[PDB]
Design a protein around this ligand. Structure first.
Ligand SMILES: CCCCCCCCCCCCCCCCCC(=O)OC[C@H](COP(=O)([O-])OCC(O)COP(=O)([O-])OC[C@@H](COC(=O)CCCCCCCCCCCCCCCCC)OC(=O)CCCCCCCCCCCCCCCCC)OC(=O)CCCCCCCCCCCCCCCCC
Ligand SMILES: CCCCCCCCCCCCCCCCCC(=O)OC[C@H](COP(=O)([O-])OCC(O)COP(=O)([O-])OC[C@@H](COC(=O)CCCCCCCCCCCCCCCCC)OC(=O)CCCCCCCCCCCCCCCCC)OC(=O)CCCCCCCCCCCCCCCCC
Ligand SMILES: CCCCCCCCCCCCCCCCCC(=O)OC[C@H](COP(=O)([O-])OCC(O)COP(=O)([O-])OC[C@@H](COC(=O)CCCCCCCCCCCCCCCCC)OC(=O)CCCCCCCCCCCCCCCCC)OC(=O)CCCCCCCCCCCCCCCCC
Ligand SMILES: CCCCCCCCCCCCCCCCCC(=O)OC[C@H](COP(=O)([O-])OCC(O)COP(=O)([O-])OC[C@@H](COC(=O)CCCCCCCCCCCCCCCCC)OC(=O)CCCCCCCCCCCCCCCCC)OC(=O)CCCCCCCCCCCCCCCCC
Ligand SMILES: CCCCCCCCCCCCCCCCCC(=O)OC[C@H](COP(=O)([O-])OCC[N+](C)(C)C)OC(=O)CCCCCCCCCCCCCCCCC
Ligand SMILES: CCCCCCCCCCCCCCCCCC(=O)OC[C@H](COP(=O)(O)OCCN)OC(=O)CCCCCCCCCCCCCCCCC
Ligand SMILES: CCCCCCCCCCCCCCCCCC(=O)OC[C@H](COP(=O)(O)OCCN)OC(=O)CCCCCCCCCCCCCCCCC
Ligand SMILES: Nc1ncnc2c1ncn2[C@@H]1O[C@H](COP(=O)(O)OP(=O)(O)OP(=O)(O)O)[C@@H](O)[C@H]1O
Lengths: 80, 52, 171, 320, 48, 63, 140, 344, 120, 98
C-alpha cells in the first residue's frame, strides 16, 4: 500500500492532509496529558455566586473564611 | 408516552427540558420557576382529571 | 420609542401579507428578506442577539438558491408584480387598511389583554436580571452540545439523510 | 441464495464479469436470408451461446420436461394455417404474432440473464426489436384489423423500453426475387404459397424503420447474400467494432442489478403482455380457458412447482 | 420429467431443516419448563 | 341420567350468567365514576414529571 | 348567535310560528352557503357570474327548504293542537322534499325527499323528546 | 437506488414513528413526522415518470402545510403554559388545530382528497407504507392527548370519512384507489372511538394493517392494478382466490371473519356512552363499504372473466413471489374471532 | 385505561405480580386453535406456491404449529394477567365507596304490583 | 409582548392563507412555507427570550434545520416538475385525475 499512499500524496495531496488531520484530531485528545484539565478550568470559573451553606456543627470539610486551607484550591492553575 | 422506551431504558433523551423549571443550562432560574415548581408538585400521582 | 416593536411587527405582517399575495418569486424573496430582516430586529428587541442573526444568515443563503431556481423554472415573458394586477393591488391596500381596522376595533371592544394600545412598551421585557453573566442569549443554543444532545443527533441526521434524499430525487 | 440485493452486496456485481465478447448480437433478415448458418458460426467462433429463433413452442422447450406441448397449450396459433388462410375469421394471424412477440420477449430475457450472470455473449436471431416488421407487413396486406396493430404497439411500448438494445445487429440483405426462389427450394408445401408482396413488406419494414432506428442505439452491419457465405469475415468485422452510441455505456453497476432482477422473474417480464385488453382475436373465454388450464396441470412434470412434482420422481418432498 | 431448468428446490435446504426442526424442539422444550415452572411457582405463592 | 342432571346443570349455568350480568353492570358503573373523578387506578392521565425539577440554589435569590 | 338558534325549543310547536320559520330558514340558508362554497371550489364555474349564480341558487333553494319546513311544522301544530307529536315534523319534513323537487326539476327527488327528509325530521323530534344526545361527552 | 441510499432512506422511515412514539416533547413528536415526510418522497419518485412526480408533489405540499399547522399548535401551547406537552387546561382552539392538521396527515375527510390521488401514481409498494406505516405516526400523537380532543369535530370527521370513503370508493375501477378509499373508511372508525377508550383505536389499526398488507401483496403477485387485471387471477395463479375472497369479505364487516370485530366492538363502546344515533349512521354506511368489495369478489373469485391467449405463457413458468407472510397474515385475518377476548 | 395505574412497570411483558395466577393448561381450547391455525397457515403456504399440501413442508408445518402455540401460550398468559388486574381494581374500588354502590335490597314478588298486559 | 404576538400569529395566518389559495406558480407556494416557519421561529425565539428559557433555546434552531430541509426537498421536486413539463405551472399536475 506504500505506492497508493504516496501516489495519492503525489497527485491529490489535499485529500491526504484532510484524512491525516482528521485522524490526528480524533487521536490527540486521548494521548494528551492536559485533556483532563479542559474540564477543570471550566469548573473554576465562578459565573454564579457561591451560595453559602448553614452550619449545624457537622460541616467540617467546607471552609469558614474564604482564605482558609481546608477547601478547594486553584493552586494547580497558577502552575499549569 | 405511547411507548415508555425512555423510561424502560431509564435514559432521558428529551424529557429534561419539558418545562421552564427544567435545569436551565447555567443555574439561571427561568421566569416563574417557583410558581410552576409549585404546580408540578401539586399534580403528582393525582393525575389529570383530579389535578384540573 | 415605546411604539418600536409594534411598528416592526406591523411591517413584518405587511411584508408577509405581500408574500401571501404571491407575486413572482423574485419579489417574493425580496419581500421575504424584508420580513426576515424585520424578524431579526424584533428578536433583537427582546434581548436576543444570537438567534436574530441566525434567521437573517440562513434565510439569506436560502434566497440565493430560490433566486437561482426561480430564474430557471418559474419565469414568464412578463413577471407579475404587486401592481401588475389591480385586484392584487386592491387586496394589498385592503389588507393594509384591514389591519388598521382590526387593530383599532379590537382596542375599543377589549380595553386590554390580547392588544394594549393605551399601554405600549411597558410590557416587553419582563424583569431582566440586572446583575449577572452567562445570561446572554445564545448560551442556550450551545446547550445543544450538553444536556440537550438529542436535538443535536436528530437535527444532524436530517441534514445527513437529506443529502441522500436530494440526490435520489434529482437522479 | 437466489439473486437479490444480498448477492450484489456480497460481491456478485455484474460489471466485473463482462468481457470483450460479452456482447448481445442479433442476426436479422428476411424469411429465408440464411440466418441460422450465419448465427451458429458467429457463436462458435466468438465463443457465445447460440439461441435458436423462438418459434411457437419456446416456453415448452424452456420449462418443464423440455418437449413440445399440445398446440392448445403453447398458444393457439399455427404457422401453417397462417400461410394457407391468412385472412381467417378466427384471428389466427394476430394470435401467432402476439404469441411470437411474447415468446421472443421471453427468449430475449433469458439471453440477458445469461450475459448478466456468467458474462458469456448471446447471439440471438430476430429479437423483439425486429419482430414488428411482420405485423407491419401483415397490416399492409390486410391480414390484421387496425384495432390489433394498436394493441401490439401498446404491448411493445410497455415492455421494450426497460431492456437494453443489442450491441450489434447483423442484417443480411436478400432481395425479394431471390428469397422467393429460396423459399420454394426448402420444400415446405405450406410455406411455398406465400406471396411476393408479403415478402416485400418485410424488406420495406427493415430498410425504412428498423435499420435507421437501430443505428441510433446500436452498431448496424449490413451484409449481402454472397458475403454471408463463409461467415468467418462477418466475425472479423464484429471482432474490430468500436462500441459507442448506445444505452450500454451509461449502465452503472446497480442499473444491471435492477435489470437483472426484472429479467430473472419471468412473470414480471410477461405481466404487461397479458394486459386485459379484450381483443376478440386474443380473448380465450372462461370455458375454453378453464379446460386448457385444468388439462395443462394434469400433465407429467406439472401440477406442482418444478422441485415438488412426485410423478417425475422428485424425492425428499417432505423436507422441501 | 427431467427438468431442463434445474429446480431451485432440487435438494432440501438442509440448513433450513436443521434450524427449523431444531428451533421447533427448542421451542417445545422451553415451553414445557415454563409451564412446569409457572405451575410450580403458582403453588408456592397462593398455597395449596 | 334423568331429570336431576339437566335441572342442576341449568341452575349452575344460571348463576354463572347472572353473576356475569351483575359484574358487567358494575364494570360500567365503576368506570363512569373513575373517569368523572380520577379517584381510581384507571384513567390516570399523565402529568409532568417531578424528578427533573432542579432544586439546587440558583443565580438570583428570587428564582 | 348561538342563543338565537336555541330559541327554536323555547315554546311548544305552533306557538310563535313566525319566529320558528325564521330559525329554520336561516339554518337551511347556512347549509346552502356551506355547501355552495364547496361547489365553487370543487368543480368551479366558468366565471364569477356563474359562480355567484350557483351560490344564489343553492342558498335560496336551501332557504326554501327551511321556510316550508318551518311553516308546515308550525301550522300543523296550531291546528290539531297536539304540540308534542313527532308526526308534525314528518309532514313538515315531507313538505321540504316536495319543495326540494320543485326547484330541482324532477319528481324522483320529490318523492324520495319526503321519505328521507320526513323520516329524518321525525326522528329529530323523537330525539329531543326522548333526550337522545348526538356528540356525547365521553363518560363511559 | 443503491444499498447505501436504500439503508439510509428506509432507516429514516423507521425512525419517524419510533421518535414520535418514544419522545415526550411535542417538538420531537413533530420532528418524527418530518422524517416520515422527507424519507417517503424519494421512494415515490423511484420510477421517475410523470405520474410519480405529480404524486410526490401533491403528497409533499399537502403534508408540508399540515406539518406547519401542527407546529403552530405546539408553539402556541409553549406561549400559554411554558411546557412542550399538551396538558389539560389548554385552549380548545390550539388542540382543534392539532386534530385539524393531524386529520390532513391521516387522510380523513373532508381533508381526504389528496390520498386517493397520490396512491394512484405510485407502485403497489409505497402504497403499503403510505397507507399502513405512515398512518401510525399521526395516530400516536392523538393517542397521548385522547382525554382532551373535542367530542364534536372528532366525530364529525369520522362520519364524513365513513361516507366519503364509501361513496367515493363505490365507483373506483383502479385497485390502488380502492385501497385508499378503504383507508378513509376504516380511519373513520379508529378516530370515531379515539376519545372513548383509545385502546380500540390500536385494535382497529392493527387489524387494518393485517388486511391491507396481504391485499397489497396479493396485488403484487402480478402487478394487477385494475378490476380487469385482477379478474384474470384465476388463470395466472388461482391459489389466492380462496383468500382474496375471505380477506376482502373480512375487510368488510361480515360477522364470521375478523373484520367485524373492530366494527362490532367499537359500536359496543360507543353504545356505552349513550351514542345511539351516530353508531347507526356509522354502522349503516359501513355495509356500503362491503359492496364494492362484493363487486370485486364477483370479478375475481366467484364468476370468472375472459382471459388472454398470452396468459398461457405465464402458467408455464414457476413463481416464487409470496414472501410466506402472505399466508400467515391471511389466516390471522379472516379467522381468530374465537380469540376475540384475547384481543379486545 | 390501566396504563397509568399505580405500580405499573413500563413496557414490560409479564410483571412479577403476574406469576401469582394459574398458568394456561397448555391444552386450552384456544392454544389448540393457535396450533390449528398454524397448521392452516402452513398448509396454505404450500397451496400458494403450488407445492403439495399436507406433504411438502413437514418441517415448516412443524415450525408453524410450535411457533403459534409457543407464542400463544405467552400472549395468553399476559391476557390472563390483564383481566386479573382489571377485576382486582374493579372490586377494590367498590369497597372504598359504599355510598356509590349501596347494597340495595330488592322486594319479593309478593309485594311488587307488576302490571299485566292481556293477550286478546 | 402581547401586542407583537397577535401580529406574528396573523402573519402565520396570512402565510397560511397564502399556501392554501394557490396561484399560477409552485415556487410561490414554497416561499409561503418559508414565511410560516419565519413566523414560527420568531414566536419561539421571543417566548424563550421572554420567559428566559435558555433550555428551550435549542428548539427554534431545530425548526429551521427541518423547515429548510422541506425547502430543499421541495426545490428538488420542482426540478422534476419542470423537467417533465418545462413550465413549473401547478395546473400541469392534473394527470392523476383518473
Ligand atoms: C400499534 C403500534 C405498534 C405497531 C406494531 C407494528 C405494526 C406492523 C408493522 C407495519 C406493517 C407495514 C410495514 C411495511 C414495511 C414495508 C414492507 C415492504 O415494503 O416489503 C414488502 C415485502 C414484499 O417484498 P417481496 O414481494 O418479497 O419482493 C422480494 C424482492 O424482490 C427481493 O429482492 P430485494 O432486493 O428487494 O431484497 C430485499 C432487501 C431490501 O433491502 C432492505 O433490506 C432494507 C434495508 C437495507 C439493507 C441494505 O433486503 C435484503 O434482501 C437483505 C439486505 C442485504 O413484504 C414485507 O416484507 C412486508 C411484511 C408485512 C409485515 C406485516 C407486519 C404485521 C404483523
Ligand atoms: C369451512 C370452509 C372451508 C373452505 C375450504 C376452502 C377450500 C379451498 C382449497 C383450494 C385448493 O386449492 O385446495 C385444493 C388442493 C388440491 O390440490 P392442488 O392441485 O394444489 O389444487 C390446484 C388448484 O387449487 C385448483 O384450482 P381450480 O382451478 O381447480 O378451482 C378454482 C376455484 C378456486 O376456488 C374459488 O373460486 C374460491 C371460492 C371462495 C372460497 C372461500 C372459502 O375457482 O389441495 C387440497 O387437496 C386441499 C387441502 C386441504 C384444504 C386446506 C385449506 C387450508 C385453508 C383452510 C382455511 C379455510 C378458510 C375458509
Ligand atoms: C391466544 C391468541 C392471541 C392473539 C393471537 C394473535 C392475534 C393477531 C392480531 C395481533 C394484533 C392485535 C393486537 C391488539 C392488542 O393487543 O391491543 C393493541 C394495544 C392496545 O394498547 P393498550 O393495551 O390500550 O395500552 C398500551 C400501553 O399504553 C403500552 O404500554 P404497556 O404497559 O402495555 O407495554 C407494552 C407491552 C405490550 O406487549 C404486548 O403484549 C403486545 C403484543 C401485541 C403483539 C400483537 C399480537 O410490552 C411490549 O410492548 C413488549 C416489549 C418487550 C420489551 C422487553 C421487555 O396496542 C398497543 O398497546 C401497542 C403497543 C406496542 C408495543 C410494542
Ligand atoms: C370454534 C373454533 C374453536 C375456537 C375455540 O376453541 O375457542 C373455544 C373457547 C372456549 O370454549 P369452551 O366452551 O369453554 O370449551 C369447553 C372446553 O373444551 C372444556 O373442555 P377442555 O378445556 O378440558 O378441552 C379442551 C380441548 C381439548 O384439549 C385436548 O386435549 C386436545 C388436544 C389436541 C388434539 C387435537 C384435537 C383438538 O378442547 C378442544 O380441543 C376442542 C375445542 C372445543 C371448542 C368448542 C367450540 C364450541 O371459546 C368459546 O367459549 C367458544 C368461542 C366460539 C366462538 C366462535 C365464533 C365463530 C363461529 C364459527 C364460525 C365458523 C368458523 C369461522 C368462519 C369460517 C369461514 C372462514
Ligand atoms: C416591500 C414588501 C412588500 C410590500 C407590499 C408592496 C407594497 C407596494 C405596493 C405598491 C405597488 C408596487 C408594485 O406593484 O410593484 C412595482 C415595482 C416595480 O415597478 P416596475 O418594475 O414594474 O417598473 C416601474 C416603471 N415605472 C416607474 C415607470 C412605472 O415593484 C415594487 O414596488 C416592489 C419593489 C420593492 C419596493 C421596496 C420599497 C422600499 C423603499 C425604501 C426606501
Ligand atoms: C359547521 C356546520 C356544518 C353544517 C353541515 C354542513 C353540511 C354541508 C353539506 C354537505 C356538502 C355537500 C355540498 C354539495 O351540495 O355538493 C356540492 C359538491 C359537488 O358540486 P356539484 O356536483 O356541482 O353539485 C350538484 C348538486 N346537485 O360536492 C362536492 O364536491 C363534495 C363536497 C363534500 C364536502 C364534505 C364536507 C362537508 C361538511 C363539512 C363539515 C365541517
Ligand atoms: C374567500 C373568498 C375567495 C374569493 C376568491 C376571489 C378570487 C381571488 O382573488 O382568489 C383567487 C386567487 C388565485 O389567483 P388567480 O388564479 O391568478 O386569480 C386570477 C387573478 N387574475 O387566490 C390568490 O391569489 C390568493 C389571494 C390571497 C389574499 C390574501 C389577502 C387576505 C386579506 C384580504
Ligand atoms: N413474427 C413472425 N410472424 C409470422 N411469421 C413468422 C414470424 N417469425 C418467423 N415467421 C416465419 O417462421 C419461419 C421462420 O423461418 P426462419 O427465417 O427463422 O428460418 P431459420 O431456420 O431460422 O433460418 P433461415 O430462414 O435464415 O434459413 C418463416 O416461415 C417465417 O416466415
Amino acid at each position: 500500500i506504500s505506492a497508493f499512499l504516496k501516489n495519492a500524496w503525489a497527485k491529490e495531496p489535499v485529500l491526504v492532509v484532510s484524512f491525516s488531520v482528521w485522524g490526528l484530531a480524533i487521536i490527540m485528545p486521548m494521548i494528551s496529558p492536559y485533556t483532563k484539565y479542559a474540564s477543570m478550568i471550566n469548573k473554576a470559573t465562578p459565573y454564579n455566586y457561591p451560595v453559602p451553606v448553614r452550619d449545624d456543627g457537622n460541616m467540617p470539610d467546607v471552609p469558614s473564611h474564604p482564605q482558609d486551607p481546608l477547601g478547594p484550591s486553584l493552586d494547580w492553575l497558577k502552575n499549569l | 408516552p405511547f411507548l415508555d422506551i425512555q423510561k424502560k431504558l431509564g435514559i432521558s433523551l428529551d424529557r429534561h427540558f419539558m418545562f421552564l423549571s427544567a435545569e436551565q443550562p447555567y443555574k439561571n432560574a427561568a421566569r416563574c420557576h417557583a410558581f410552576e415548581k409549585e404546580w408540578i408538585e401539586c399534580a403528582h400521582g393525582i393525575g389529570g382529571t383530579r389535578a384540573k | 420609542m415605546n411604539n418600536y416593536i409594534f411598528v416592526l411587527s406591523s411591517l413584518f405582517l405587511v411584508g408577509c401579507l405581500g408574500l401571501a399575495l404571491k407575486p413572482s418569486p423574485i419579489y417574493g424573496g425580496l419581500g421575504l428578506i424584508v420580513s426576515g430582516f424585520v424578524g431579526c430586529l424584533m428578536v433583537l428587541g427582546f434581548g436576543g442577539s444570537f438567534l436574530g442573526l441566525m434567521v437573517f444568515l440562513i434565510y439569506l443563503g436560502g434566497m440565493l438558491v430560490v433566486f437561482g431556481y426561480t430564474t430557471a423554472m418559474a419565469t414568464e415573458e412578463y413577471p407579475e408584480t404587486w401592481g401588475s394586477n389591480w385586484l392584487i393591488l386592491g387586496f394589498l391596500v385592503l389588507g393594509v387598511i384591514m389591519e388598521v381596522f382590526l387593530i383599532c376595533v379590537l382596542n375599543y371592544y377589549d380595553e386590554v389583554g390580547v392588544i394594549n394600545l393605551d399601554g405600549l412598551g411597558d410590557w416587553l421585557m419582563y424583569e431582566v436580571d440586572d446583575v449577572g453573566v452567562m445570561l446572554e442569549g445564545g448560551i442556550g443554543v450551545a446547550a445543544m452540545y450538553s444536556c440537550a444532545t438529542w436535538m443535536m443527533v436528530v437535527a444532524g441526521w436530517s441534514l445527513f439523510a437529506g443529502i441522500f434524499i436530494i440526490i435520489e430525487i434529482t437522479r | 441464495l437466489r439473486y437479490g440485493l444480498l448477492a450484489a452486496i456480497l460481491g456478485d456485481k455484474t460489471t466485473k464479469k463482462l468481457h470483450e465478447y460479452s456482447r448481445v448480437i442479433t442476426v436479422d433478415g428476411n424469411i429465408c436470408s440464411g440466418k441460422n448458418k450465419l448465427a451458429k458460426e458467429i457463436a462458435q467462433q466468438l465463443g457465445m451461446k447460440h439461441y435458436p429463433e423462438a418459434g411457437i413452442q419456446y416456453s415448452s422447450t424452456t420449462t418443464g420436461d423440455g418437449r413440445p406441448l399440445d398446440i392448445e397449450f403453447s398458444g393457439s396459433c399455427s404457422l401453417e394455417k397462417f400461410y394457407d388462410d391468412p385472412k381467417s375469421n378466427d384471428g389466427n394471424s394476430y394470435r401467432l404474432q402476439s404469441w411470437l412477440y411474447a415468446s421472443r420477449l421471453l427468449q430475449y430475457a433469458d439471453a440477458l440473464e445469461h450475459l448478466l450472470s456468467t458474462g458469456q455473449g448471446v447471439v440471438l436471431e430476430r429479437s423483439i426489436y425486429s419482430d414488428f416488421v411482420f405485423l407491419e407487413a401483415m397490416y399492409n396486406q390486410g391480414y390484421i384489423r387496425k384495432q390489433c396493430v394498436d394493441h401490439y404497439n401498446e404491448i411493445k411500448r410497455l415492455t421494450l423500453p426497460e431492456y437494453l438494445p443489442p450491441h450489434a445487429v447483423i442484417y443480411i440483405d436478400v432481395p425479394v426475387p431471390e428469397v422467393q426462389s429460396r423459399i420454394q427450394k426448402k420444400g415446405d408445401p405450406h410455406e411455398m404459397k406465400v406471396t411476393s408482396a408479403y415478402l416485400q413488406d418485410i424488406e420495406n419494414a427493415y430498410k425504412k424503420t428498423f435499420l435507421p432506428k437501430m443505428s441510433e442505439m446500436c452498431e448496424v452491419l449490413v451484409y449481402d447474400s454472397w458475403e454471408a457465405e463463409d461467415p468467418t469475415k462477418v466475425v472479423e468485422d464484429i471482432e474490430y467494432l468500436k462500441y459507442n452510441k448506445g444505452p450500454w455505456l451509461k449502465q452503472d453497476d446497480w442499473t444491471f442489478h435492477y435489470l437483472r432482477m426484472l429479467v430473472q422473474d419471468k412473470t414480471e417480464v410477461l405481466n404487461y403482455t397479458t394486459i386485459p385488453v379484450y381483443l376478440p382475436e386474443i380473448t380465450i373465454g372462461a370455458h375454453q380457458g378453464s379446460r386448457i388450464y385444468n388439462s395443462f396441470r394434469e400433465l407429467p412434470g406439472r401440477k406442482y412447482a418444478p422441485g415438488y412434482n412426485a410423478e417425475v420422481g422428485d424425492k425428499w418432498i417432505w423436507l422441501k | 420429467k427431467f427438468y431442463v431448468r434445474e429446480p431451485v428446490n432440487a435438494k432440501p435446504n438442509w440448513l433450513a431443516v436443521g434450524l427449523s426442526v431444531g428451533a421447533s424442539v427448542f421451542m417445545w422444550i422451553y415451553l414445557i419448563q415454563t409451564h412446569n415452572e409457572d405451575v410450580l411457582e403458582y403453588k408456592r405463592r397462593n398455597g395449596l | 341420567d334423568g331429570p336431576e342432571k339437566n335441572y342442576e346443570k341449568t341452575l349452575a349455568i344460571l348463576q354463572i350468567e347472572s353473576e356475569k350480568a351483575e359484574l358487567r353492570l358494575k364494570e360500567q358503573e365503576v368506570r363512569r365514576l373513575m373517569r368523572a373523578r380520577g379517584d381510581g387506578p384507571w384513567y390516570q392521565f399523565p402529568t409532568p414529571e417531578k424528578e427533573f425539577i432542579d432544586h439546587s440554589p440558583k443565580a438570583t435569590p428570587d428564582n | 348567535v348561538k342563543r338565537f338558534f336555541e330559541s327554536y325549543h323555547e315554546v311548544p310547536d305552533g306557538t310563535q310560528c313566525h319566529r320558528k320559520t325564521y330559525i329554520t330558514t336561516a339554518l337551511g340558508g347556512i347549509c346552502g352557503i356551506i355547501g355552495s362554497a364547496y361547489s365553487v371550489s370543487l368543480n368551479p364555474a366558468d366565471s364569477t357570474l356563474e359562480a355567484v349564480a350557483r351560490v344564489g341558487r343553492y342558498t335560496f333553494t336551501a332557504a326554501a327548504i327551511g321556510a316550508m319546513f318551518g311553516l308546515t311544522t308550525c301550522v300543523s301544530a296550531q291546528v290539531r293542537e297536539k304540540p308534542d307529536d313527532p308526526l308534525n315534523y314528518f309532514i313538515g319534513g315531507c313538505a321540504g322534499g316536495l319543495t326540494l323537487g320543485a326547484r330541482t326539476h324532477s319528481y324522483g327527488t320529490a318523492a324520495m325527499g319526503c321519505v328521507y327528509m320526513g323520516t329524518a325530521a321525525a326522528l329529530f323530534k323523537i330525539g329531543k323528546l326522548e333526550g337522545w344526545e348526538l356528540f356525547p361527552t365521553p363518560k363511559v | 437506488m443503491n444499498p447505501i441510499t436504500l439503508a439510509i432512506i428506509y432507516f429514516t422511515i423507521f425512525l419517524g414513528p419510533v421518535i414520535t412514539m418514544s419522545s415526550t416533547n411535542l417538538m420531537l413528536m413533530w420532528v418524527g413526522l418530518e422524517f416520515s415526510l422527507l424519507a417517503i418522497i424519494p421512494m415515490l419518485i423511484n420510477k421517475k415518470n410523470p405520474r410519480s412526480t405529480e404524486a410526490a408533489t401533491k403528497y409533499f405540499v399537502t403534508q408540508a402545510t399540515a406539518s406547519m399547522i401542527i407546529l403552530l399548535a405546539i408553539v402556541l401551547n409553549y406561549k400559554q403554559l411554558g411546557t412542550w406537552m399538551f396538558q389539560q387546561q389548554t385552549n380548545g382552539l390550539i388542540l382543534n388545530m392539532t386534530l385539524m392538521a393531524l386529520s390532513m396527515k391521516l387522510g380523513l375527510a373532508p381533508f381526504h382528497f389528496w390520498l386517493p390521488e397520490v396512491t394512484q401514481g405510485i407502485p403497489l409498494h409505497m402504497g403499503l407504507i403510505l397507507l399502513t406505516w405512515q398512518k401510525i405516526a399521526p395516530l400516536s400523537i392523538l393517542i397521548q392527548i385522547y382525554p382532551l380532543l373535542n367530542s364534536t369535530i372528532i366525530l364529525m370527521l369520522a362520519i364524513t370519512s365513513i361516507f366519503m370513503g364509501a361513496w367515493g370508493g363505490l365507483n373506483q375501477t383502479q385497485m390502488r384507489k380502492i385501497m385508499a378509499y378503504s383507508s378513509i373508511a376504516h380511519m373513520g372508525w379508529m378516530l370515531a372511538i379515539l376519545p372513548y377508550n383509545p385502546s380500540l383505536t390500536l385494535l382497529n389499526l392493527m387489524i387494518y394493517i393485517i388486511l391491507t398488507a396481504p391485499m397489497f401483496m396479493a396485488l403484487m403477485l402480478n402487478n394487477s392494478m385494475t378490476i380487469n387485471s385482477i379478474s384474470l387471477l384465476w388463470n395466472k395463479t388461482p391459489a389466492m382466490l380462496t383468500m382474496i375472497s375471505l380477506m376482502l369479505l373480512s375487510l368488510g364487516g361480515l360477522p364470521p371473519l375478523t373484520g367485524f370485530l373492530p366494527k362490532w366492538i367499537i359500536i359496543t363502546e360507543l353504545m356505552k356512552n349513550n351514542c345511539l344515533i351516530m353508531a347507526t349512521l356509522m354502522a349503516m354506511m359501513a355495509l356500503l363499504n362491503l359492496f364494492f368489495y362484493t363487486r370485486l369478489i364477483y370479478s375475481t373469485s366467484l364468476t370468472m372473466f375472459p382471459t388472454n391467449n398470452n396468459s398461457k405463457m405465464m402458467t408455464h413458468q414457476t413463481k416464487t413471489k409470496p414472501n410466506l407472510m402472505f399466508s400467515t397474515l391471511a389466516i390471522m385475518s379472516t379467522m381468530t374471532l374465537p380469540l376475540a377476548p384475547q384481543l379486545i | 385505561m390501566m396504563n397509568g395505574r399505580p405500580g405499573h412497570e413500563p413496557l414490560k411483558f409479564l410483571p412479577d405480580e403476574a406469576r401469582s395466577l394459574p398458568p394456561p393448561k397448555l391444552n386450552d381450547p384456544r392454544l389448540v386453535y393457535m396450533g390449528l391455525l398454524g397448521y392452516c397457515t402452513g398448509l396454505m403456504d404450500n397451496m400458494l406456491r403450488m407445492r403439495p399440501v399436507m406433504r411438502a413442508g413437514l418441517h415448516r408445518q412443524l415450525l408453524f404449529v410450535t411457533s403459534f402455540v409457543f407464542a400463544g401460550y405467552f400472549y395468553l398468559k399476559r391476557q390472563n394477567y390483564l383481566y386479573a388486574v382489571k377485576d382486582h381494581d374493579m372490586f377494590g374500588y367498590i369497597k372504598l365507596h359504599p355510598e356509590d354502590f349501596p347494597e340495595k335490597e330488592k322486594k319479593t314478588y309478593a309485594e311488587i304490583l307488576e302490571p299485566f298486559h292481556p293477550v286478546r | 409582548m402581547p401586542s407583537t404576538f397577535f401580529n406574528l400569529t396573523m402573519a402565520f395566518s396570512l402565510s397560511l392563507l397564502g399556501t392554501l389559495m394557490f396561484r399560477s406558480h409552485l415556487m410561490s407556494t414554497l416561499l409561503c412555507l418559508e414565511g410560516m416557519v419565519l413566523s414560527l421561529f420568531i414566536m419561539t425565539s421571543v417566548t424563550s427570550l421572554n420567559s428566559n428559557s435558555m433550555s428551550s433555546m435549542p428548539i427554534p434552531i431545530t425548526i429551521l434545520v427541518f423547515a429548510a430541509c422541506e425547502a430543499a426537498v421541495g426545490l428538488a421536486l420542482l426540478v422534476k416538475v419542470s423537467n417533465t413539463y418545462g413550465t413549473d405551472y401547478v395546473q400541469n399536475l392534473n394527470l392523476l385525475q383518473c
